[PDB]
Every structure is written in C-alpha cells, then in structure tokens.
Design an enzyme around this catalytic site. Structure first.
Site, PDB file in Angstrom:
ATOM      1  N   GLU A   1       0.810  -1.202   0.000  1.00  0.00           N
ATOM      2  CA  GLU A   1       0.000   0.000   0.000  1.00  0.00           C
ATOM      3  C   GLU A   1       0.870   1.290   0.000  1.00  0.00           C
ATOM      4  O   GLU A   1       0.578   2.301  -0.663  1.00  0.00           O
ATOM      5  CB  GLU A   1      -0.969   0.039   1.172  1.00  0.00           C
ATOM      6  CG  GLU A   1      -2.098  -0.935   1.208  1.00  0.00           C
ATOM      7  CD  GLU A   1      -3.142  -0.580   0.195  1.00  0.00           C
ATOM      8  OE1 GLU A   1      -2.987   0.536  -0.361  1.00  0.00           O
ATOM      9  OE2 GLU A   1      -4.003  -1.405  -0.203  1.00  0.00           O
TER      10      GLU A   1
ATOM     11  N   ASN B   1      -7.686   9.590  -5.259  1.00  0.00           N
ATOM     12  CA  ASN B   1      -8.601   8.745  -6.062  1.00  0.00           C
ATOM     13  C   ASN B   1      -9.372   9.575  -7.017  1.00  0.00           C
ATOM     14  O   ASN B   1      -9.585  10.727  -6.804  1.00  0.00           O
ATOM     15  CB  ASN B   1      -9.550   7.960  -5.138  1.00  0.00           C
ATOM     16  CG  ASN B   1      -8.745   7.161  -4.189  1.00  0.00           C
ATOM     17  OD1 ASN B   1      -8.803   7.362  -2.994  1.00  0.00           O
ATOM     18  ND2 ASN B   1      -7.724   6.566  -4.780  1.00  0.00           N
TER      19      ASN B   1
ATOM     20  N   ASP C   1     -12.528   9.599  -7.313  1.00  0.00           N
ATOM     21  CA  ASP C   1     -13.690  10.197  -6.634  1.00  0.00           C
ATOM     22  C   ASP C   1     -13.397  11.412  -5.754  1.00  0.00           C
ATOM     23  O   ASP C   1     -14.317  11.950  -5.126  1.00  0.00           O
ATOM     24  CB  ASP C   1     -14.465   9.183  -5.791  1.00  0.00           C
ATOM     25  CG  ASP C   1     -13.699   8.695  -4.542  1.00  0.00           C
ATOM     26  OD1 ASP C   1     -12.495   8.972  -4.280  1.00  0.00           O
ATOM     27  OD2 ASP C   1     -14.254   7.848  -3.771  1.00  0.00           O
TER      28      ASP C   1
ATOM     29  N   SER D   1     -11.444  11.490  -3.105  1.00  0.00           N
ATOM     30  CA  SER D   1     -11.045  11.043  -1.801  1.00  0.00           C
ATOM     31  C   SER D   1      -9.513  10.862  -1.892  1.00  0.00           C
ATOM     32  O   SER D   1      -8.972  10.831  -2.969  1.00  0.00           O
ATOM     33  CB  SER D   1     -11.748   9.809  -1.356  1.00  0.00           C
ATOM     34  OG  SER D   1     -11.348   8.715  -2.180  1.00  0.00           O
TER      35      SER D   1
ATOM     36  N   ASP E   1      -6.122   8.647   0.005  1.00  0.00           N
ATOM     37  CA  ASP E   1      -5.628   7.538   0.838  1.00  0.00           C
ATOM     38  C   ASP E   1      -4.405   8.050   1.572  1.00  0.00           C
ATOM     39  O   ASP E   1      -3.540   8.661   0.947  1.00  0.00           O
ATOM     40  CB  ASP E   1      -5.210   6.434  -0.127  1.00  0.00           C
ATOM     41  CG  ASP E   1      -6.388   5.775  -0.783  1.00  0.00           C
ATOM     42  OD1 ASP E   1      -7.530   6.013  -0.299  1.00  0.00           O
ATOM     43  OD2 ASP E   1      -6.263   4.978  -1.738  1.00  0.00           O
TER      44      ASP E   1
ATOM     45  N   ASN F   1      -8.600   5.602   3.703  1.00  0.00           N
ATOM     46  CA  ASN F   1      -9.418   6.459   2.777  1.00  0.00           C
ATOM     47  C   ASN F   1     -10.264   7.560   3.497  1.00  0.00           C
ATOM     48  O   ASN F   1     -11.010   7.307   4.456  1.00  0.00           O
ATOM     49  CB  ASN F   1     -10.261   5.600   1.785  1.00  0.00           C
ATOM     50  CG  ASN F   1     -10.924   6.464   0.720  1.00  0.00           C
ATOM     51  OD1 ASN F   1     -12.098   6.831   0.810  1.00  0.00           O
ATOM     52  ND2 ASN F   1     -10.187   6.831  -0.244  1.00  0.00           N
TER      53      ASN F   1
ATOM     54  N   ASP G   1     -15.105  -4.275   9.889  1.00  0.00           N
ATOM     55  CA  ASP G   1     -16.204  -3.702   9.107  1.00  0.00           C
ATOM     56  C   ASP G   1     -17.040  -4.704   8.323  1.00  0.00           C
ATOM     57  O   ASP G   1     -18.091  -4.377   7.756  1.00  0.00           O
ATOM     58  CB  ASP G   1     -15.637  -2.671   8.125  1.00  0.00           C
ATOM     59  CG  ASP G   1     -16.710  -1.794   7.529  1.00  0.00           C
ATOM     60  OD1 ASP G   1     -17.562  -1.304   8.308  1.00  0.00           O
ATOM     61  OD2 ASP G   1     -16.785  -1.546   6.314  1.00  0.00           O
TER      62      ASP G   1
END
Length: 129
Positions: free
Chosen positions: A35, A46, A48, A50, A52, A59, A101
């Site tokens: 990562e 990203n 969208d 957003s 990271d 995120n 989650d």
C-alpha cells in the site's frame, strides 16, 4: 518515516495486530508493503476526490477527515494527517475498525491483489518478534 520490514512487524505486534480478527502479522506487513512501501507519509488521490493516507492507505471517504472530501464520514474520528505520523498508533487503531467492518482485509486492494492466498509468513521471516 520509512520503516524497515522487521521494525514495522515489531511495531504492529506491539500494537496488537498479530492475529487481529484472525489476520496473522504477515498479512499486515504485506499490506503495508504494497500500500505504502512502508512510508508513513504516503498519500494517493482517487478519482472520486477522496485521498488515501499513511502506511495502510486509509481512505478519507469513510475513515478520516481531510476537509476536502465532500459528504465523507470520519468513522475513525481523526484528521487524516494523523495517519501520516511517525507513530503508527492512529493508523493501527483505525485499521482495527476497518478490518472489523465486514469485508476483513479485502478493504485493502493491494492486500487482495498481492497478498491474499500467498505465503505472507515470508514478510516476518528473520524478524525478532
């Protein structure tokens, strides 16, 4: 900070990640590896809007607040900048929420695509844990 492999394994272990929700330590190290290349300061934008953040590329869309991700949640209750610290405490605490989650470690794309189903024990081999 750029961690070394065993330094990170140790850090994670002390923070209670070894076998957290059934994920052996090798998984967490492997996931950090792909990562962020073990760099706490890693950021990635990203499509969208957003972003990271940090060693586990958490995120802004769901988990932290960066002030520039409209209609995002801050489920970990942290500013995203906190994820970039040399102290991984916040990154670990938030990751524990993420893995709980429902989708497990599949929440981390690079884990799914590059760690999952591999010999993840190789990431800790030779470390003094």
């Amino acid at each position: 900070k750029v961690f070394g492999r065993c330094e990170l394994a140790a850090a994670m272990k002390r923070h209670g990640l070894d076998n957290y929700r059934g994920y052996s330590l090798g998984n967490w190290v492997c996931a950090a590896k792909f990562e962020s290349n073990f760099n706490t300061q890693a950021t990635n934008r990203n499509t969208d809007g957003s972003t990271d953040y940090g060693i586990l590329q958490i995120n802004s869309r769901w988990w932290c607040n960066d002030g520039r991700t409209p209609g995002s949640r801050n489920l970990c209750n942290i500013p995203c900048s906190a994820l970039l610290s040399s102290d991984i405490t916040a990154s670990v605490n938030c990751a524990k929420k993420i893995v709980s989650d429902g989708n497990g470690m599949n929440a981390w794309v690079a884990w799914r695509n590059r760690c999952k189903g591999t010999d993840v024990q190789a990431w800790i081999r030779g470390c003094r844990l």
